Design an enzyme around this catalytic site. Structure first.
Site, PDB file in Angstrom:
ATOM      1  CB  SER A  76      -2.953  -4.035  -9.479  1.00  0.00           C
ATOM      2  OG  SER A  76      -2.812  -2.693  -9.902  1.00  0.00           O
ATOM      3  NE  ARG A  77       3.564  -3.525  -4.955  1.00  0.00           N
ATOM      4  CZ  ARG A  77       4.179  -4.056  -3.908  1.00  0.00           C
ATOM      5  NH1 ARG A  77       4.231  -3.434  -2.742  1.00  0.00           N
ATOM      6  NH2 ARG A  77       4.762  -5.242  -4.034  1.00  0.00           N
TER       7      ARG A  77
END
Ligand SMILES: Nc1ncnc2c1ncn2[C@@H]1O[C@H](COP(=O)(O)OP(=O)(O)OP(=O)(O)O)[C@@H](O)[C@H]1O
Ligand SMILES: [Mg+2]
Lengths: 49, 237, 60, 203, 46, 100, 118, 118
Positions: free
Chosen positions: B76-77
């Site tokens: 997840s960024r």
């Protein structure tokens, strides 16, 4: 020998006490579990309605 | 312009500023790969657009790892910003730890530290398994990950981990429900709440059975059988 | 002679009997734990039965 | 990425091939070393056999080691396995012969009492949860007479301790022993034939 | 040397080949911007 | 999303694009439908700051598959706060291109 | 589990898990054979080979090819049999005992004809 | 060597050599296991694993992804630490001690937390 006998008697008495305590605690846990699950089922029935 | 097709589509999913109302649109695009080839044109295009990916494997799915998230490759960024304080605190480096565990498991396919790492990683993998249509509220997820990362599953056998988790959660739901209430309301796990949870876990471990019931608290043919003998130079007596 | 033999038997029996008392403690603990687990299991099974029954009735 | 993966696998397989060929040649030399050791041990064995023959022919045969026991119900079994695993089916064949011997002893109403040499048999019996009374490891490649002496001393002490045993009681000995000694091991028939065999060493 | 590179319980000739090849490989190395006159190369190879 | 493996390791925030990518039958639709269903409590709160309105776009999917998804959403109560934009396999390439 | 029941699903998932582990181990087995695996993996590989043979069946339409009449296995018997396989209740039977047969009765007959008793 | 100096260049080249050898041995370890390597190869593998972990660092901008604040390692300390690693002076520490840390002080603290001593 006397020390071993005394320690064994104490261990057995403590074992009985702990068994009673854990059994009653488990009974209370079962009661609470049943109540919570009944509430969950009631919510499900309301959802169906 | 096939990349543009998806780039302009997925860039409309945004988080607006307060000046525009603070509305948001979260996107969950789905992409099908063929023969696990994330290198195909469209998968590579989309992976470079979205804010992270959950990459699912047939191999992991068949192994019983469901959902079949490939921890090493999935990211997840947004990271901790997309989590509540308690989840951040308990799941701070879970993904990295699982990636390291997979690496070590492949390597060790052994000192004490490696044994401990493998044991914890196996327990965490078991913890992250989840059936379908069985959502877990954020507070329950926090408590489960707390069981995992804080080392309270080390005494539990791997095969029982799942069951343990469920039972323990049920316990916390039946009694000590104020832990979930505190986590949900305050979005964080207070130190006294943490102590109460640890005590509840340790107590519950007394009444939990493993699969084997163990405590979690703390014909050859005689002719073929050659016979050794002693040679003796005597007449048969 | 009886005193010496009885003392050797005393040492042996005391050691084995300490071990036996510890094992009996663990046995009682395991029995109580199994009883607790059985109570919880049957309670949750009864709850599941109740929810299934009442859901079926609501659907009907 | 299919071609890149295939090229990586080709490199990996080449490395494995080189390593396996090297190990094959090393094992070829080690066979000669082991045969030389067997030849070196031959003369002492032959002459001590001759000495035992003379002594027996000039003495009475009453040794407890030499006389069987009545209604025996305990046989010691020493399973000789390797330490490293790159042997093909050596350990598997040894353990299968050991299982055959265990079944045979069960037919004779005797519970095998297990001793092990080598790590592989240890792993096998640990997986099966069968107990190992004693274990020696780390010399199956190049066993010395020290290890054999220790093993034989242990087995003989157990067998002697089995003389006075009654039922399951140890008896006057104070320690429970066995009524028999068997050895399961692989017999080097030739460069091409290697056979697992059970050989009753005592009485 | 590249034949024997996978391998010490070898023939004396094989061990000598391995050591000689290691020395030759180390000999063929050379730093950047350091060309050698032909005679110097001849002596090093010698 | 209600899924530990996601909420703990690859958390999804509001306004984020998270790609669910994988081979066929690996559980992608299951993850997305579970995520939609998990917003039921947020919807029941009635607070638009907490409510999440879901849009399920089905592109090139079999009609009965979309019906199955809709039924699953119905049973979980999600269909109250969900819209389905359906472009089944039978549709023209125009609809499949246009549905997202 | 919603449609086919809990036991059907459990048995199917265990069979799939065993076969997936065998597929994973194929890389090692193609080079070194089965004997370099751990005891757990060796047992799993034997179980998996038996399972994959038992998934085969003498089909009705295969009689024209082999001359052998086909077999029909009730679903309940299939679930019971594969539950027994996954638990290692037939590990002693030879692999070929599981090849191109129907239910457990056929398994017993073929194992006996081979030499092992079920 | 001209720009960074002899020590830095030599340490970097030795690190690269160790990592290249480890990369070559990786598949051998995967298939045949690490016990079939030579003593020198086993020592090199331990060193290489520690080196690759120590090349990782808790980055300042990565806090949002780990919650751990970042660190900065001066060049002199980096050269010294990797010289020590290539010489085998930290082979007594678990490799986990080298994961996402700063300089040598962080290594000592994390090794202490893991029970090792530096
Ligand atoms: N967490 C889970 N646990 C168990 N089974 C699951 C789980 N998630 C999905 N499944 C099952 O896996 C199968 C595939 O799920 P799903 O339809 O979501 O996958 P998909 O990748 O979207 O598939 P498709 O290629 O058909 O679009 C279905 O049987 C689904 O019930
Ligand atoms: Mg789908």
């Amino acid at each position: 020998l006397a020390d071993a006998d005394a320690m064994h008697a104490k261990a057995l008495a403590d074992a009985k006490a702990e068994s009673e305590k854990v059994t009653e605690e488990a009974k209370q846990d079962s009661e609470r579990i049943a109540a919570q699950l009944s509430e969950q089922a009631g919510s499900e029935a309301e959802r169906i309605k | 312009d096939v990349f543009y097709l998806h780039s302009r589509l997925l860039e409309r999913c945004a988080k607006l500023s307060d000046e525009l109302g603070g509305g948001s649109m979260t996107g969950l695009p789905i992409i099908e790969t063929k023969a696990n080839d994330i290198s195909a044109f469209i998968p590579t295009n989309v992976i470079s657009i979205t804010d992270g990916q959950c990459f699912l494997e047939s191999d992991l799915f068949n192994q019983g790892v469901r959902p079949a998230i490939n921890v090493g490759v999935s990211v997840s960024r947004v990271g901790g910003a997309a989590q509540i304080k308690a989840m951040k605190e308990v799941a701070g480096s879970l993904r990295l730890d699982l990636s390291q565990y997979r690496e070590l498991e492949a390597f060790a396919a052994l000192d004490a530290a490696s044994k401990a790492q493998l044991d914890r990683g196996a327990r965490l993998v078991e913890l992250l398994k989840q059936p379908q249509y069985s959502p877990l509220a954020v507070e329950e997820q926090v408590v489960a990950i707390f069981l995992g990362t804080q080392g309270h599953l080390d005494s539990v056998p791997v095969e029982d981990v799942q069951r343990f988790e469920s039972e323990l959660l049920e316990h916390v739901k039946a009694s000590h429900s104020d832990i979930f209430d505190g986590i949900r309301e305050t979005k964080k796990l207070s130190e006294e709440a943490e102590e109460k949870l640890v005590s509840v876990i340790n107590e519950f471990k007394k009444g939990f059975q493993a699969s084997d019931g163990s405590s979690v608290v703390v014909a050859l043919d005689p002719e073929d059988l050659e016979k050794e003998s002693v040679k003796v130079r005597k007449p048969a007596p | 002679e009886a005193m010496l033999a009885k003392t050797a038997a005393d040492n042996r029996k005391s050691a084995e009997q300490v071990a036996a008392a510890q094992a009996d403690y663990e046995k009682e603990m395991a029995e109580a734990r199994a009883q607790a687990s059985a109570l919880r299991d049957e309670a949750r099974a009864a709850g599941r039965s109740v929810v299934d029954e009442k859901r079926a009735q609501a659907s009907g | 990425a299919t071609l890149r993966e295939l090229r990586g696998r080709i490199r990996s397989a080449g490395s494995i091939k080189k390593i396996t060929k090297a190990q094959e040649l090393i094992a070829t030399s080690r066979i000669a070393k082991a045969q030389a050791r067997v030849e070196a041990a031959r003369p002492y064995a032959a002459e001590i056999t001759n000495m035992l023959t003379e002594l027996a022919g000039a003495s009475a045969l009453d040794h407890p080691l030499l006389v069987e026991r009545k209604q025996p119900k305990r046989a010691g079994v020493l399973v000789v396995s390797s330490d490293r695993g790159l042997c093909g089916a050596y350990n598997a064949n040894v353990l299968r012969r050991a299982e055959e011997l265990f079944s045979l002893l069960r037919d004779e109403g005797k519970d095998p009492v297990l001793y092990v040499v080598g790590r592989k048999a240890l792993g096998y019996f640990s997986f099966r949860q069968r107990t190992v009374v004693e274990s020696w490891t780390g010399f199956s490649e190049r066993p010395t007479y020290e290890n054999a002496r220790e093993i034989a001393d242990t087995l003989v002490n157990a067998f002697m301790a089995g003389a006075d045993d009654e039922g399951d009681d140890a008896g006057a000995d104070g320690i429970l022993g066995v009524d028999e000694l068997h050895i399961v091991f692989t017999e080097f028939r030739s460069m091409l034939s290697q056979t697992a065999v059970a050989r009753r060493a005592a009485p | 040397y590249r034949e024997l590179e996978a391998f010490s319980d070898l023939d004396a000739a094989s061990k000598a080949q391995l050591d000689r090849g290691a020395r030759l490989v180390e000999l063929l190395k050379q730093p950047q911007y350091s060309p050698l006159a032909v005679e110097e190369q001849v002596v090093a190879i010698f | 999303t209600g899924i530990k493996a996601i909420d703990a390791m690859t958390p999804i925030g509001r306004g984020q694009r998270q790609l669910i990518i994988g081979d066929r039958k690996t559980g992608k639709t299951a993850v997305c439908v579970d995520t939609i269903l998990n917003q039921r409590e947020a919807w029941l709160t009635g607070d638009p700051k907490q409510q999440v309105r879901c849009v399920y776009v089905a592109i090139g999917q079999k009609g009965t598959t979309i019906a199955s998804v809709k039924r699953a959403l119905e049973e979980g109560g999600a269909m109250e706060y969900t819209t389905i934009v359906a472009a089944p396999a039978s549709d023209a390439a125009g609809f499949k291109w246009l549905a997202p | 589990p919603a449609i086919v029941g809990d036991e059907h699903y459990r048995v199917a998932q265990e069979v799939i898990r065993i076969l997936q582990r065998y597929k994973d181990l194929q890389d090692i087995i193609a080079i070194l054979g089965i004997d370099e695996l751990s005891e757990e993996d060796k047992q799993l590989v034997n179980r998996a080979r038996r399972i994959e043979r038992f998934l085969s069946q003498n089909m009705m339409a295969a009689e024209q090819f082999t001359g052998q009449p086909g077999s029909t296995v009730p679903l309940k018997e299939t679930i019971e049999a594969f539950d027994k396989l996954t638990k290692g209740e037939f590990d002693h039977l030879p692999e070929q005992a599981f090849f191109l047969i129907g239910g457990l009765d056929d398994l017993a007959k073929k194992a006996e004809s081979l030499g092992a008793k079920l």
